[PDB]
C-alpha cells in the first residue's frame, strides 16, 4: 500500500483515518473490493475525485501489461456507400483500471466511461467487467 517515496494518501482523507468511497452515477454499483480494500488510488472512479462524464463505451480487454491501466479494443463495422457493404474495423483505447477489479484479465468484456484526461492517452476509466474464457495465459491487471 505504501511502497513509494512519498506517503500515499487518499484525495479525501479524514479521521473518525477513514476509508472514503463515493459512488459514480447512472447505476454502476461500486465493487466490494473498493469498500473494504486498503489500496490507494487517486484515479479510481469510486475512491477519488474523478467524475464520469458523457461518453460511455465498451470493448474487449486485450493488454494488461501496464500499471493500473489496460488497453480496450473496440470492434465495429464501417459502411461504404458505393458498394453497399460493411467492413471490419477496430480502435484501441487506453483506459485506467483501478485495483478494485483484482480478477480482471485479458479477454474480458469491460464497460468504460469518460473522465478528465489522466495521461497522454488515457481518458476513459473502467466501470465494470464481465469475465470470459481462458487462453492458456491468465494475465491479470
Amino acid at each position: 500500500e505504501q511502497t513509494e517515496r512519498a506517503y500515499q494518501k487518499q484525495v479525501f482523507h479524514h479521521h473518525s483515518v477513514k476509508r472514503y468511497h463515493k459512488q459514480i452515477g447512472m447505476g454502476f454499483v461500486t465493487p466490494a473490493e473498493a469498500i473494504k480494500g486498503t489500496y490507494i488510488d487517486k484515479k479510481c472512479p469510486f475512491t477519488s475525485d474523478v467524475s464520469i462524464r458523457g461518453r460511455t463505451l465498451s470493448g474487449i480487454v486485450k493488454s494488461c501489461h501496464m500499471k493500473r491501466t489496460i488497453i480496450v479494443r473496440r470492434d465495429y463495422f464501417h459502411y461504404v456507400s458505393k458498394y453497399q457493404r460493411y467492413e471490419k474495423r477496430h480502435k484501441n483505447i487506453a483506459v485506467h483500471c483501478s485495483p478494485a477489479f483484482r480478477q480482471l484479465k485479458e479477454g474480458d468484456h469491460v464497460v468504460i466511461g469518460q473522465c478528465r484526461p489522466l495521461s497522454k492517452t488515457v481518458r476513459f476509466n473502467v466501470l465494470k467487467f464481465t469475465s470470459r474464457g481462458t487462453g492458456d495465459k491468465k494475465q491479470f491487471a
Binding site: 474464457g133 481462458t134 487462453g135 492458456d136
Partner: protein, 76 residues
Amino acid sequence: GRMYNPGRGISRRCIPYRRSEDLYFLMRAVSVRHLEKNKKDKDAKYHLILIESKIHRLTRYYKSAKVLEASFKYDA
C-alpha cells in the same frame, strides 16, 4: 468431397426413423514418421504433411470447445 483428395464418397450409416479419441487415432503420424529409413519416399513425406495439417485442425477445435487443456501441442 474429401478434405484433401478430389474423391466424393457418400457411404453413410443410416439411423432409422425410430428413437426407441479421433485425434488420438490420428497420431498414424507416428507410424509414418518409417520415414527414418525410407528417406527418399517423397510420397509418405507428403501424406505426413496432410496428416499433420489435420491434427492442427482438430487441436484448433478441441481448444475452442474447451475440451483439451489450453497448453496442448502435438510434437514428436
